[PDB]
Amino acid sequence: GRLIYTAGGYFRQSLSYLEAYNPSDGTWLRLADLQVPRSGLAGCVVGGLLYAVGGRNNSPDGNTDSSALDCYNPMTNQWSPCAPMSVPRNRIGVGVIDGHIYAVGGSHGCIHHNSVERYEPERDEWHLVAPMLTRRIGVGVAVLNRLLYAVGGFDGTNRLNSAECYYPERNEWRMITAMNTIRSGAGVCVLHNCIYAAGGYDGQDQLNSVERYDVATATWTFVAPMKHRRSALGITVHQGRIYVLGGYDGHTFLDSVECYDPDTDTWSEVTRMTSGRSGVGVAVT
Numbered sequence: 063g064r065l066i067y068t069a070g071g072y073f074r075q076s077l078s079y080l081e082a083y084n085p086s087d088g089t090w091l092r093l094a095d096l097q098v099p100r101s102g103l104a105g106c107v108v109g110g111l112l113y114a115v116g117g118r119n120n121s122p123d124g125n126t127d128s129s130a131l132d133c134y135n136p137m138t139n140q141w142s143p144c145a146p147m148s149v150p151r152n153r154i155g156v157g158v159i160d161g162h163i164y165a166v167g168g169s170h171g172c173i174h175h176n177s178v179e180r181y182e183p184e185r186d187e188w189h190l191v192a193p194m195l196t197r198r199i200g201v202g203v204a205v206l207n208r209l210l211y212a213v214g215g216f217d218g219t220n221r222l223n224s225a226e227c228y229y230p231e232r233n234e235w236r237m238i239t240a241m242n243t244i245r246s247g248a249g250v251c252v253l254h255n256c257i258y259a260a261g262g263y264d265g266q267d268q269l270n271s272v273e274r275y276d277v278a279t280a281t282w283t284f285v286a287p288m289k290h291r292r293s294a295l296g297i298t299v300h301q302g303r304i305y306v307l308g309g310y311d312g313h314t315f316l317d318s319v320e321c322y323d324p325d326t327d328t329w330s331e332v333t334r335m336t337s338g339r340s341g342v343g344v345a346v347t
């Protein structure tokens with residue numbers, strides 16, 4: 063059995079919540095809080111351990127971008143600090159290849175990173191890899207066919223519909239087919255050999271649209287839109303289905319959790335988070 067973990071987020075200030083949802087019975091476990099509250103972080107899992115990467119602590123006493131990497135063990139209910147990244151990265155994207163964590167883009171104040179770095183849990187060390195062709199904050203990250211994809215975001219001037227791919231053996235990036243829609247702060251994941259980009263902001267409107275990248279045809283196709291338009295949503299895959307958690311729609315910090323079934327091409331509202339929040343990091347283990 064596996065759970066959907068949600069770490070951090072934002073509602074009035076950055077949050078430290080760590081909760082786990084069980085899609086089988088609809089329950090939520092309240093787990094050990096993060097040591098530092100963070101929103102705009104990303105989550106990932108390597109060897110059954112959950113990692114909270116980057117983000118920012120927006121508090122009444124100040125706003126600080128995070129270069130932190132923290133590791134949570136579900137067996138011990140404890141968070142442990144790991145080696146920090148070279149730079150703080152708020153609104154970061156993360157992907158895992160062969161048990162190695164890639165921290166992609168994100169911001170540190172007014173700096174919009176195009177830099178990318180890779181963490182080895184086996185050595186507790188980070189190292190920079192080739193930088194992206196585009197600076198991207200609010201970027202979605204997908205791992206497919208041992209390639210790392212960086213989708214959408216904001217380059218410091220424009221919100222982006224562009225996407226690019228990293229080749230680990232060659233240590234290089236190339237631009238791929240751009241999405242139909244500009245999406246900054248979308249939820250990006252991989253399901254059944256396809257990349258999905260759900261929601262996000264196009265520069266004018268919060269989106270409920272969802273599009274899917276097919277590798278063989280190099281095309282983005284729209285699938286069923288979500289019930290609730292949202293940006294800065296958590297996203298993950300559990301048992302062949304996509305789950306989107308929270309986010310912000312221009313008026314509300316959503317507690318909605320929707321689930322996409324690819325066989326029927328339908329979204330259904332399956333539960334609510336214990337409190338409405340945006341900018342969470344999510345992972346399954």
Ligand SMILES: COC1CC2(C1)CN(c1cc(Cl)c(C(=O)N3COc4c(cccc4-c4cc(N5[C@@H]6CC[C@H]5COC6)c(C(=O)O)cc4F)C3)c(Cl)c1)C2
Nearest residue numbers: 072101102153199200216221246247263293294310340341
């Ligand atoms: C009472 O007024 C207050 C309430 C207020 C203003 C504090 N409000 C807040 C405060 C916060 Cl700390 C957040 C939040 O969770 N963040 C900050 O943005 C992001 C987070 C994570 C991923 C992407 C974005 C992002 C979010 C963006 N924004 C888009 C889509 C969401 C966000 C705002 O709407 C436009 C953009 C962008 O502008 O392109 C780029 C991104 F990387 C984390 C949100 Cl979502 C709203 C909203």
